[PDB]
């Protein structure tokens, strides 16, 4: 519906220069938040008042003030197999903030 939402983003750790310390997995589903912040809103979302006020000021003064932005509002962990100070392969069971759980306009 052209509104702020979660969509797929497969991240390869080698592509981002993290494969020097992340051994596994090779790739993971990080998701991303894409779409607009405009009126009217999706009826099942959690908007802030600052995002609604800024979006309205944007409409009136579009060259000076930016619209609201679609961003992750909650993140989930993943497990990684990483190399510790000596190099030993070690499991990090809950590696926080790697994957989008919820999107919203902020």
Which residues sit at the interface with Na ion, rule CB under 5 A?
A: 28-29, 61, 63-64
3-class secondary structure per residue, 54-65: HHHHHHHCCCCC
Q: Is 81 in the site for a copy of itself (CB under 8 A)?
A: no
- The single residue among 21, 25, 53, 94 that binds a copy of itself, judged by CB under 8 A, is 53
**Residue 36 near residue 3 (C-beta atoms within 8 A):** yes
Could you tell me the smallest distance in angstroms from the CB atom of residue 58 to Na ion? 9
Which is closer to a copy of itself, CB of 32 or CB of 42?
A: 32
Other C-beta atoms lying within 10 Å of the C-beta of residue 31: 22
Indicate which of Na ion, a copy of itself, Cl ion, none lies near residue 79 (CB less than 5 to 8 Å, by partner kind). Answer: none
C-alpha to C-alpha distance for 84 and 21, rounded to whole angstroms: 8
How many chain residues bind a copy of itself (CB under 8 A)?
32
Neighbour-count burial of 23, counting CB atoms closer than 10 A to its CB (0-12 exposed, 13-18 middle, 19+ buried): middle
Q: Which stretch binds Cl ion (CB under 5 A): 15-23, 35-43, 66-74, 81-89?
A: 35-43
């Amino acid at each position: 519906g052209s509104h702020c939402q979660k969509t797929s983003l497969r991240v390869n750790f080698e592509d981002i220069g993290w494969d020097s310390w992340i051994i596994a997995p090779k790739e993971y589903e990080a998701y991303e938040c894409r779409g607009g912040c405009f009126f009217p809103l999706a009826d099942d979302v959690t908007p802030t008042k600052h995002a609604i006020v800024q979006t309205l000021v944007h409409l009136k003064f579009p060259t000076k003030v930016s619209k609201a932005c679609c961003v992750p509002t909650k993140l989930s962990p993943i497990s990684v197999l990483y190399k510790d100070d000596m190099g030993v392969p070690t499991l990090k069971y809950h590696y926080e903030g790697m994957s989008v759980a919820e999107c919203g306009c902020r």
